[PDB]
């Protein structure tokens, strides 16, 4: 379903992208953080954790994750922690491996964001 949209619908794909920019900035702007680039700005896990708190109504204590990750390892850990917060919110475990997000695979990243957008469309 999402593959067909990614691989075979570029005019649609960019509609969805501009909107994911809208969506994630709706939330992260509140923290004085702007997303301009979807291909890299979620790779380190930080925005996904912060976004999950924004979408699901909690703060994440700073000792629970790496706010300024200093390795590939800490980024993978941040992303894994985000996927866990996702499943707590009732999402099924995301299809992408945490490494796929850290490695900036665009399909993987857009899939996760898309699934968030869809679940949390009315959240303000």
């Amino acid at each position: 379903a999402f593959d067909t949209l990614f691989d075979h619908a570029p005019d649609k794909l960019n509609v969805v992208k501009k909107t994911l920019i809208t969506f994630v900035n709706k939330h992260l702007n509140k923290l004085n953080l702007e997303v301009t680039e979807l291909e890299t700005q979620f790779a380190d896990g930080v925005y996904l954790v912060l976004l999950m708190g924004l979408l699901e109504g909690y703060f994440v204590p700073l000792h629970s994750f790496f706010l300024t990750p200093d390795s590939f390892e800490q980024k993978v850990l941040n992303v894994s922690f985000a996927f866990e917060l996702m499943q707590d919110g009732g999402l099924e475990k995301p299809k992408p491996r945490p490494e796929d997000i850290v490695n900036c695979d665009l399909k993987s990243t857009l899939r996760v964001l898309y699934n968030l957008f869809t679940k949390y469309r009315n959240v303000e």
Partner: protein, 268 residues
């Protein structure tokens, strides 16, 4: 200690469902109770063991301003990890201050609430070690039939219960938003929470009500967001609020030091 038998619980009416699981009003052995049913992803024998070791500490019967967990249902054999406590007719302090459609508590009752909570917390601070994951806020204090404020032991989070997610950061000390509990003086962090409760009793407003939880924690932790000291209250209330919310944890008073201050405030 086999706990309470889940089969002896009479579930009367569902009160809530949220991130923690659900709350019902019910009855057990001639007691009017609430039943808190915890929902937990990836429940394990290890977590179930931990639940059964953590609950006994919450069964505090020796202080009027502490509300004990009466007992818990071990899971297995219960469908879910479950705990029970007495039904408090006014609900939470939060309910009474902010959701009180019937009457507004006066400032004399506010002062007595503050004294009640200070006394409850001074007591809990005598426990060795401290009860872990106990956060003081207006949601975790209940108001009994005679308006007595009581620290809610059924609001202590268990080691497997929403770790890494904080749903009431507005009452949490700045250091406790950022540092592991091991790396914090827990007693001083709790006095910050009391300072916020004083602010809440003075303003009759939810602290940072216009901000999401994530916004509160990030700005308090990283940007120095603080409650604005309310305008034209007594200098003595003002001074107490200020000392309890000292930026420096080491300079915040202990609960047992502010108890006599609060006693003199009821009637000098």
């Amino acid at each position: 200690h086999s706990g309470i038998d889940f089969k002896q619980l009479n579930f009367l009416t569902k009160l809530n469902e949220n991130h923690s699981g659900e709350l019902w009003k019910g009855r057990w052995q001639g007691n009017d109770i609430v039943v808190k049913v915890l929902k937990v992803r990836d429940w394990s024998t290890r977590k179930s063991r931990d639940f059964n070791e953590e609950c006994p500490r919450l069964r505090i019967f020796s202080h009027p301003n502490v509300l004990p967990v009466l007992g818990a249902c071990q899971s297995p054999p219960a469908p879910h990890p479950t705990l029970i406590t007495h039904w408090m007719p006014y609900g939470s302090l939060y309910n009474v201050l902010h959701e009180g459609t019937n009457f507004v508590v006066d400032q004399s009752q506010a002062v007595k609430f503050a004294l009640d909570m200070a006394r409850g917390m001074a007591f809990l601070h005598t426990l060795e070690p401290l009860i872990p994951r106990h956060a003081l806020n207006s949601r975790s204090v209940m108001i009994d039939e005679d308006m007595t404020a009581r620290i809610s032991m059924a609001d202590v989070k268990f080691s497997f219960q929403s770790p890494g997610r904080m749903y009431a950061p507005a009452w949490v000390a700045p250091e406790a938003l950022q540092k592991k509990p091991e790396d914090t003086n827990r007693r001083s962090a709790d006095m910050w929470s009391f300072a916020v409760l004083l602010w809440e009793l003075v303003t009759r407003e939810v602290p940072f009500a216009d901000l999401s939880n994530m916004e509160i924690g990030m700005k308090v932790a990283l940007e120095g967001l603080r409650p604005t000291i309310p305008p034209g209250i007594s200098p003595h209330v003002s001074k107490l609020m200020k000392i309890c919310m000292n930026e420096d944890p080491a300079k915040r008073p202990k609960f047992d030091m502010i108890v006599p201050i609060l006693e003199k405030m009821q009637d000098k």
